[PDB]
Design a protein around this ligand. Sequence first.
Ligand SMILES: [Br-]
Ligand SMILES: [Br-]
Ligand SMILES: [Br-]
Lengths: 97, 91
Amino acid sequence: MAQYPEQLNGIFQALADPTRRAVLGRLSRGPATVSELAKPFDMALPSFMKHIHFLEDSGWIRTHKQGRVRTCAIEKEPFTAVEAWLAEQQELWESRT
Amino acid sequence: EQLNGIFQALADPTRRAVLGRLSRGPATVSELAKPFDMALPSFMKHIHFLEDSGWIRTHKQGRVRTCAIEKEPFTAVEAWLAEQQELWESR
Ligand SMILES: [Br-]
Ligand SMILES: [Br-]
Ligand SMILES: [Br-]
């Protein structure tokens, strides 16, 4: 039984944005604060926060606020989900008779 | 801007299910449209997005448009994933 579609929709939508993919690339190297993550990007912080929030809501990252500081870390589950969906299609392709 | 389109294509469940079917072999739009309770014009727009993003190729002869899944987007998604995995391992 394939994963329910609603779980995958948001996971893939998160990856459709280059800012979000860049943030995930950084968090793959280890955790970071929002202010650190925002530095490469020419957008106002509210616009950047939309990306952070989307990443958290879709399960790609976890964040924690203490005072004015918000720490972020990558989550591995969505990687597993993407891998799983891909592998399923690739099994169908390689098993063609 | 290329992974943007590839992943935006994958964000829709209809588009994912079409790519599932095309993984089994090529198919006409008519064949692909069959499982879904969707107006053809809405369906065509999913097909059009899949083609435009690079996930599929299509070709029309007479009244029949045949669709085939493309290799390159899979390689691209696999590349993004491998790139992330290599970053996690780095010390
Ligand atoms: Br859905
Ligand atoms: Br911060
Ligand atoms: Br057709």
